[PDB]
Structure formats: C-alpha cells, structure tokens
Structure 1
Amino acid sequence: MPGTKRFQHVIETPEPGKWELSGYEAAVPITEKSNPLTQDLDKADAENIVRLLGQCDAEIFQEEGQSTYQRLYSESILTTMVQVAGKVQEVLKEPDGGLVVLSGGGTSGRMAFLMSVSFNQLMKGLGQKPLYTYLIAGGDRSVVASREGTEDSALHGIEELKKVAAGKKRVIVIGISVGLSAPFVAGQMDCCMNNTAVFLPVLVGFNPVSMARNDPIEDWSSTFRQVAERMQKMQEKQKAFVLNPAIGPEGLSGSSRMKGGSATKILLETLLLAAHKTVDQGIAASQRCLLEILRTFERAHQVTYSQSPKIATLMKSVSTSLEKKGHVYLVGWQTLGIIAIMDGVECIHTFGADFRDVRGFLIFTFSQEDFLTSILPSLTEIDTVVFIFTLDDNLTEVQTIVEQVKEKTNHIQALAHSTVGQTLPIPLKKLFPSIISITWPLLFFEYEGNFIQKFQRELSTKWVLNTVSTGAHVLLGKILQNHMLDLRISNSKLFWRALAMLQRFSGQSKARCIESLLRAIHFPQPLSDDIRAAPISCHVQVAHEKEQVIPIALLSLLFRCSITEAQAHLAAAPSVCEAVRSALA
C-alpha cells in the first residue's frame, strides 16, 4: 500500500499496559529511551534537576551487571580501546602519509573538533606535525551553528572524507554517532571498509549494534545497522573497530548532546591520550594506562557535582531571566568559551530557543574591548552573565569585563577552575560573592600543555553548562515528563522521534499517528498518495519550516479531530504547554 515501505520498520503501538510485553520497548535504542530516573523531571525543582541529571551523568561510569549490555568499564570495551590505541600508534610512528580523522554530525562533530585541536596542540608541543583533523556534517560553519538537517546525506559524509584524505597513505577514521544513527557517518565507515589498504574505520556510539538505525538512507543502499554489523565482523581481523559501551538513557530523552558527548570525550580523550603518552615511553598501551585516565574522569564527575547547590542557583537565575524575556551570556576564555558557544547554539534546536536566549562568547569570538563596546550596551536588570575561566587565564582581562557588566546587570555568577593553593585575586572578588570554584588536586601530568587538566576542565564545564541550560528550560514548563514534545522536525531522526512520541502519548495506532503527523506537516494540502509515499526528507523539508507541528498532531489524535479543529483549539488556549497537558488529562 502507499506508505508501507517508508514506515515498515516502525513497530505498532502497544495496547494499553502491555508496553513492556509487546517488546516495542526493547527495540527502542538505548539512546532514545526514557530514563526512569527522570520520569518526573517536569515536576522536579532546580535542586532535584541537578541531582537527577548528575545521577544520569554518573551512569556513564556504572559497571556491567550479571545477562546485559557491555559498559565503559567492561573488559570487551577496554580491550577494544587498547587495540585501537595500538592502531593510532602505527600511525604516530609513521606520520608521513598518516592522518587521523574524527567525524560526526551535531554535537558529535563539535566534540570531534575540540579533541582534534587538543591532540594537534600535544604534537605541536613535541615538534611533531599535527596528524589530527575533524569532519562535521555541513562543514566547519556547522561547529558553532545549529544545523540539524545536514547529517542525513551519506554522500556528503563521503565527500568531506575524500577531501581530507587527499593523498594520505594511512587514515584512521573515527566516526562518532551516539545513536549509531547519522548517515553522514554511515557513509564514511562504509567507504573505509571498501579501501582497507588505506583506511581504518572506528565507530563510536552508545547503542549495541542490534539497536543501530536500520531505516533506509536516502542516498545510500545499506543502513547503519548493516554497516555496523560488518565492521564488527572485521574487528576479528583488526581491520575495523566498534567502540559501543552503553551509558544509559539521557535525562532528557534523545538529547545526546548531554551524556552522549560527555562520553564521546571521556572515551576518546582517554584512548588517544593513552596512545600518545605510551609511544614515547616505548611501552604498549595497557588497560592500566586507560583506567588511570578513566578514574580521573570519574573523579571529575564527583568534583563537579559536589558544587550541586550552587549549580542549582545559576540554573534558577538562567530560568528567571528567560522567564521574563531577558538574555543569558556565557563568557569564556579559550576552550571553555567554545564549549560555552556550543552549549548556547544547541539550545536553539533543543528547546526552540532564539540564538540570543543563551549565547556563548569567547575572548561568537569577540575580544576584550570589542565585547565592551558592541554587546555591553544591550544588557538589563533581568539578564544573567556567566564568567567561565581558570586562574591561569589572564584575570586582568577578566576583572575588567565583570566590573563593567556589574553596572548594568548585577545577576552575575561564575565558573572558575583552579589547582589547590591558587587564590582568587582581589580579596574583594565579591563581584562574585558565592562563586563556583572548582578546585582540582595536583595530578602527575608529564606533557607540557598539561592535557589531562584540560580535558577534566572542559568536561566539568560541559556538565555544568548542559545541566544549567537544560534545567532552566525544564523549570519553565517546556519539557513534557522527560521528553521535548514540541521540537522542530529538522532531520530524519527527529522525524522518527516525533512519530514515536505521538505513539507514546496518544496510545493510538501507528497508522493513525503517521496520518496525523503527515497531515500536520503538510496542512493545508491533504494526504495524497504521493505525500504518503514520499521520502522522509520531503516531510522534513516542510515540517522544519512550521511551528507546533507535533503538538498539533497530538491534539488532533486525542480530540479525534481535524488539523483545522486542533489548530483553532490550540490558538484558543493560554499556551501550547497548557493546551497539550490538559488534552492529556
């Protein structure tokens, strides 16, 4: 029938109460699952939120139970990390013709960028040619942009990969798809497998291969699941690797920028840092070298979330300043200003939030006096500015900008990384009364840029910014239980997630849910057979441009009514959230 092939993979909606025993629920990839810890995130206050997400973040480090999924500290995973590290060594030994690529859509691509820099720095500091580079879906514009649509072409991924692999003789391609989902990555991995002489694919994600996307890719004949299954076969001969620990579901469902990206860093910095530090020691990388690093990262979570109460406060002040109609600024020096930018930009697609809502700033890249003249004018009684730095930064530049912002804002808090025994200049740094000083033990670094300290610091900041930005929005009633219902359908993955949410909250049939969403997307044109049979990109291209698509579709399903009727109902309610919540009642 028209539509049958396109929606073929979509499991039917369970009957009421048999949600567990239809095993629709066991096919929901871990990455898309609803984390049980956050059943009621829409009711937690700011302090609970920080707890529950700090709890969710912890599941990264949790170990394997006794018929269940391999985890970060499982021996199969660590054994793979070792083997990969070893393959990076082969390349570090022969850098003439060598290249290491870290590739990913969205936050995966963002994380790939940061990392590729760090390991480029580390070889600069040893007088070695930088071997790292990155690819991000939609080119480098994408790194600091919201560009969700760009992950859907396998050909694109392959083109970006063909460019960079120039006339290199040995290329390690680390494709990062948290959900083992993005066609961008898919293509690359497959391309790698077709030319084993030159390429080595390593696939990073956080689902078992059996939960890897298996829907058709528009410009490609295989699915991620097939590509991934075949890589798993080649691992037996060390010509491909799959690094896929389960870190548990995201505190906000499907928001892989959070635990996903954190784990992407934890997992890869660890592995690569081990590989470098062990080559010039003349030693092979062991599980012991990796575990030192893993446990340092695990400490970082404890170090970070021990400031919970103050994190909860920054949230309350970001929540509030948005609750009015004010803006929030994240002002960071070096890498922590990037991470600031990346958090803020992600708020657009993740929350339907304007690019001013939570903006990030690096000293997007507007230096001291430039920031002073340009932006400082636009601040207000209600805004919130957030300073993010270390004590090794140049706090003469820092103190200045605070002094100025203080005048016009007064809602300023800060995020300050320090070793023990560094002290915050100006005993009257009461510009910040109750800082978030995050103070790091002394650690036995050997490399000159002290890269372990770097990686700890980024991640700690990422957890903070992530929890804060996420929490503020949750507090404002915009999340439904632990799902973003009202997202913007801007790629195929989000189209399927929308459909899954309609099935969940309506309980009504797959076919009904599909019919309601397509109607919502394409209204005022009614369902033709063309539309039914169209490639999901057609739906995406049309949905991406409209507002409240998913809520409207859900309202039509519950009230068993037309798009016309549901639109008019909506418009005649105080808000989208209030409308949906009481239709659900």
Structure 2
Amino acid sequence: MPGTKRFQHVIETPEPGKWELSGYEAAVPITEKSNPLTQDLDKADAENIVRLLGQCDAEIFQEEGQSTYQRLYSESILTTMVQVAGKVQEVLKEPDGGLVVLSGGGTSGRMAFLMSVSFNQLMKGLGQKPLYTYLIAGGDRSVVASREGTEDSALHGIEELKKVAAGKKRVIVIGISVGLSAPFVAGQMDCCMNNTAVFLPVLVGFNPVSMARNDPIEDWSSTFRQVAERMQKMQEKQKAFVLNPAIGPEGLSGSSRMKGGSATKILLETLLLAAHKTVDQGIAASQRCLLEILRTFERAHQVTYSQSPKIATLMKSVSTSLEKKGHVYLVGWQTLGIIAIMDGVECIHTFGADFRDVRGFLIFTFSQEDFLTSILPSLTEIDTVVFIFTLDDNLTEVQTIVEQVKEKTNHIQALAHSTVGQTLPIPLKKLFPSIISITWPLLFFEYEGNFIQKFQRELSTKWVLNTVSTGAHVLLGKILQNHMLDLRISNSKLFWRALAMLQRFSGQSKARCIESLLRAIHFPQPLSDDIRAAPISCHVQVAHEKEQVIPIALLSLLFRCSITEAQAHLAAAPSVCEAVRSALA
C-alpha cells in the first residue's frame, strides 16, 4: 500500500514487556540506543549528571568482554589503525600529488576540520607542504553553523570530494560518520571504491557494519550498509578500511556530538600522529606507538573528571542563567575558542536553543577591543561568562576582558590549562575565586608545536563544555528520561529518531506511530496517498519549519485523539514538558 516501501526497514513496536525478546532492541544501532547508566538522567542533580556523563565517556576506553563487539583496545581495531597509519605514511613519502581528506557531516565535519588544521600545522612546522584538507556537509560555513539538513545528499558529498581531489594522484579519504549513517559520507566512500588507483577510503564510525544504516538514500542507489560491507571485503586486500569500534551508547540518546565526536579525535589523532612521528624515524607504525597515545588520552579523561565538583558548579550557573532567561558566553583563545563556538552552535539543534543562549567566541571571531566594544555592553546580572585558555596564551589580553566583564557580571567561572609548575599571574587573579585548573604532567613530546599537548587540552575542554551544555539543559527539564523528545526534524535520521521515540513512548503500533507523525507534520493537510508515499525529504522539509511536531504527535497517540485536539490540549497546558509528562502518566 502507499508508503509500505518508504517504511519497510522500520521494525514493529514490540508488545508490553517483550522489548527485549522481540529483538527490536537487538537491531537498534548502538549509537541510537538508550544508555542504561542514564535511565534517570532527567532526575539527576548537577553532581550526579557529571558523574553519569564522565562515566559514559569512560566507556570509550572500556575493553572487550569475552561473544560481543570489538572496541578501541581490541586487536582487530588496533591492527587496522596500524595498517592505516601505514598507508598514510606512503602518501607522506610522496607528497607530490598526494592528499589526505577528513570528511563528515555536523560534528563529524567539525572534528574533521580541527584535525586537518593540526596536521597541517605539524607539516608546516616541519617546512613541508600541507597535505590535509577537510570536507563538511554544506561547505565550510557548516563548520561553525547549525545546518543539520545538509548531510542527506550523496551527490553533494561526491561533488565536494571531486572539487578537492582536483588533479591529485594519491588520495586518502577518511569518511567519518559516527552512526555509519550520513549519506554525504556514503557517496564519497562508494566513489573511492570505483577508482582505487587514486583513492583509498577509510570509514570511521561506532557501530558494527551489521548495524550500519540501511534505508534508501534519496539521490543514491546503495545503502550505507552496502557500502560498508563492500569496504570490509576490500580490507582483506588493503584497498579499503573500516575503523569502527563500539564505544557504547550516548548519555543523551543519539547525541553523537558527545562520545562520538570525542572518540573520533581520540582515534584519528592517535593514528595520524603515530604515522607522522614514525616516518621521520624510518620505523613502521606499531601497536605500541598507538597504545602510548591512547593511554595518554585515557589519562586525559581521568585528569579532566578529577575536577568534577567544579564542573557541576559551572553547570548550576549555566542552568540558572538560562532558567531566568539570560545568555551564556564562552570565551576562548586559539583552538579552544573554536571548540567553544562549536559547542554553543550544537546546542541550537540539540536542545532547540537560541544562538544567544550559549554562544562561543574566539580571540564569532571577535578581537580584544572588538569584543569589549560590541558584546560587552549586552551583559547582565544573571548572565554567565566562561573563560577558556592556557597559561601559554597572552594573559594580558585575558585579564583585561575579564576585568571589564566582572563589573557587568559576577557569574564568571573559568577553565585553565597548565603544565605543572606554571602559575597564575596576579595571586589576586582571584578575579576567579575557585577556577577549574587542569594541570598536565610533563610528557616527552618531540614535534615543534607539541601536538599531543594540544589534543589533550582540546579533548578535555570538549568534555567539559559538552557535559556542562548538555547538563544545563537536562536540569531545565527539557529531556525525557535520556531522550530529547522535542527535537526539530531537519534530516532523515532525525525523522527516524522521532518515529522510534513515538513507538517507545506510546507503545502503539508502527502504523499508528507513522500516521500520527505524518499528520502532525503536515497538518492542516490530511493524509493523502501522495504524502504517505512521499520521499522522507518531503516530510523533513515541512517539519523543519514547525514547533512541537513530536510532542503533538505523541499526545495525539496517547489520547487517541486528532491533531486538532492535541494542539488544543498542548496550548491548554502550562508547558510542553508538563503536557507530555502528565500525558505519559
């Protein structure tokens, strides 16, 4: 019937109590699963939230149990890292006409960008031509914007890839998609396999290939799953690689910007840095070199969450200022500035939040005086401003701006990275009472810009900011158990996530859930056979423009009522969240 094929890959809602034994659960990709640790994240206070997310992050480093999924420290994965470092070396010997592309959508694209800069700095420092570039769904602008809609085209991915691979002779394309999901990446990987002379694809994500996305892509014939099964067959001959350790579900379900983006850096910085540092030594990359780097990243998690209490306190002050209706400013220097802007932007699509609600700044790129002149005026009693820097930064630029803001704010906390035995200028630097000092043991780096120290700090800041931004919103009651129910449908994945969430919270059939969602999306237009059979992109395009799509659809299901009736009830309620939670009860 109309729509059957569009919706075929969707599994039926299991009966009450049979969610386990249906094996609906067994087919939910790890990246989409509910994390058991965060069952009650919506009831944790600020310190528990910090404890719970630090613990979810720790799962990146958990080793394989004895019939189960390969993980970061499993031998098959590390061996694949080794072989990939190998192939990157080949290109580093023959830079002429060589290129290395790091590509993803959303946060995968963001992570790509940072890494491409770093390894370009590193080749610069050695006086070598930069060989890295990045690709991101929707073009360069996407690096620092909420543009969730742009990942759904495989021709787009391929076009970007063809632009940059210009007239190169040897191209490594590292397609990153946490969910093994983005059609932007799938097209690149497939195109690489049709020209193996030139291209070597390397696919990075965090699901087993058996769980890779398998619904049709609108502008492409193969599914991500097919593309990844075929890359895996090519790996036996070293013409493709799939690098896909499980890292366990996200603490906020399906929020792959968190563990996923972190694991992307951990995994790729490790491997790229091993490759570089072993070419000039005339020595193959080896498990042992990678391990050293992985264990350093693992210490970085411990070190970072040593500051949990003060992490929780920044949480409380970010949530407060949002709860009144203030804004939160994230002020950082060099690469940590960039990461700040990335965090704030991601809050737009992740929590429905305004661009002003949690925004980042680099010294979006506003110089010292420029920030003092334009932004400084807009501050208020109830706002919160966060300073993020190292002791290597230019602390006269720092303290100035802090001085200025201190008058207008009072809620300022800060995030400071030091090697042990560095001190804070002004012992009266008690402009910040009780800082989040994060102090890094001395380590034996040998490259000029000390790249291992940069990656540690970036990763640690990422974790802090991710945990704060995410925690501040959970405190406001915007998250249900460990799901963001009220998201904005802006791509096909988000559309499947919504339908999934409707089945889980209603317990009602697939067909009912699908019908409610399409009615909520296209109201006031009734369901027609065309709408039922339309490409998912049609539903996305319409839903992306509306508010409360998913809650309305869930209310209509729970009260077994019309869309007209569910909107009226929502408008009659004190808030979306209360309407939903009391309807659930």
TM-score range for the pair, normalised by the shorter chain length: over 0.9
Deviation at 1:203, TM superposition (A): 0.1
Deviation at 1:426, TM superposition (A): 0.1
Deviation at 1:209, TM superposition (A): 0.0
Deviation at 1:332, TM superposition (A): 0.3
Aligned-partner SS, 1:375 = helix
What is aligned with 2:557? 557
Deviations along 1:223-244, one digit per CA (max 9) or x if unpaired, are 0000000000000000000000
Deviation at 1:568, TM superposition (A): 0.1
Deviations along 1:93-139, one digit per CA (max 9) or x if unpaired, are 00000000000000000000000000000000001000000000000
Deviation at 1:310, TM superposition (A): 0.1
Deviations along 1:482-513, one digit per CA (max 9) or x if unpaired, are 00000000000000000000000000000000
- Separation (CA, whole Å) in 2 of partners of 1:313 and 1:167: 53
Deviation at 1:81, TM superposition (A): 0.1
What is aligned with 1:526? 526
What is aligned with 2:173? 173
Deviation at 1:405, TM superposition (A): 0.1
What is aligned with 1:112? 112
Deviations along 1:392-431, one digit per CA (max 9) or x if unpaired, are 0000000000000000001000000000000000000111
Deviations along 1:238-273, one digit per CA (max 9) or x if unpaired, are 000000000000000000000000000000000000
Deviation at 1:447, TM superposition (A): 0.1
Aligned-partner SS, 2:6 = coil
- Separation (CA, whole Å) in 2 of partners of 1:324 and 1:526: 39
Deviations along 1:204-238, one digit per CA (max 9) or x if unpaired, are 00000000000000000000000000000000000
What is aligned with 2:52? 52
- Separation (CA, whole Å) in 1 of partners of 2:282 and 2:127: 18
Deviations along 1:17-54, one digit per CA (max 9) or x if unpaired, are 00000000000000000000000000000000000000
- Separation (CA, whole Å) in 2 of partners of 1:391 and 1:513: 54
Number of equivalenced pairs? 585
- Separation (CA, whole Å) in 1 of partners of 2:271 and 2:524: 52
Deviation at 1:306, TM superposition (A): 0.5
- Separation (CA, whole Å) in 1 of partners of 2:430 and 2:445: 33
- Separation (CA, whole Å) in 2 of partners of 1:155 and 1:373: 44
- Moved >4 Å (runs of 4+): none
Aligned-partner SS, 2:138 = coil
- Separation (CA, whole Å) in 2 of partners of 1:86 and 1:125: 22
What is aligned with 1:405? 405
Deviation at 1:438, TM superposition (A): 0.1
Deviation at 1:432, TM superposition (A): 0.2
Aligned-partner SS, 1:564 = helix
Deviation at 1:169, TM superposition (A): 0.0
TM-score scaled to structure 1, two decimals?
A: 1.00
Deviation at 1:145, TM superposition (A): 0.1
- Separation (CA, whole Å) in 2 of partners of 1:142 and 1:42: 31
- Separation (CA, whole Å) in 1 of partners of 2:295 and 2:422: 24
Deviation at 1:311, TM superposition (A): 0.2
Deviations along 1:502-532, one digit per CA (max 9) or x if unpaired, are 0000000000000000000000000000000
| Structure 1 residues without counterparts, runs of 5 or longer | none
Deviation at 1:305, TM superposition (A): 0.2
What is aligned with 2:5? 5
Aligned-partner SS, 1:370 = helix
Deviation at 1:474, TM superposition (A): 0.2
- Separation (CA, whole Å) in 2 of partners of 1:177 and 1:165: 20
Aligned-partner SS, 1:202 = strand
What is aligned with 1:33? 33
Deviations along 1:429-454, one digit per CA (max 9) or x if unpaired, are 11100000000000000000000000
Deviations along 1:462-492, one digit per CA (max 9) or x if unpaired, are 0000000000000000000000000000000
Aligned-partner SS, 1:48 = helix
Deviation at 1:82, TM superposition (A): 0.1
Deviation at 1:200, TM superposition (A): 0.3
Aligned-partner SS, 1:265 = helix
- Separation (CA, whole Å) in 2 of partners of 1:373 and 1:128: 40
What is aligned with 1:517? 517
Deviation at 1:534, TM superposition (A): 0.2
What is aligned with 2:309? 309
TM-score scaled to structure 2, two decimals?
A: 1.00
Deviation at 1:276, TM superposition (A): 0.1
Deviation at 1:307, TM superposition (A): 0.1
- Separation (CA, whole Å) in 2 of partners of 1:39 and 1:6: 31
What is aligned with 2:200? 200
- Separation (CA, whole Å) in 1 of partners of 2:380 and 2:89: 53
- Separation (CA, whole Å) in 1 of partners of 2:257 and 2:279: 32
Aligned-partner SS, 2:365 = coil
- Separation (CA, whole Å) in 1 of partners of 2:61 and 2:580: 36
- Separation (CA, whole Å) in 1 of partners of 2:316 and 2:337: 22
RMSD over aligned CA atoms reads 0.2
Aligned-partner SS, 1:119 = helix
Deviation at 1:336, TM superposition (A): 0.3
Deviation at 1:144, TM superposition (A): 0.1
Deviation at 1:387, TM superposition (A): 0.1
Deviation at 1:146, TM superposition (A): 0.1
Query: Where in structure 2 are the equivalents of 1:534-549 lying within 5 Å?
Result: 534-549=534-549
What is aligned with 2:82? 82
- Separation (CA, whole Å) in 2 of partners of 1:150 and 1:313: 36
- Separation (CA, whole Å) in 2 of partners of 1:438 and 1:218: 47
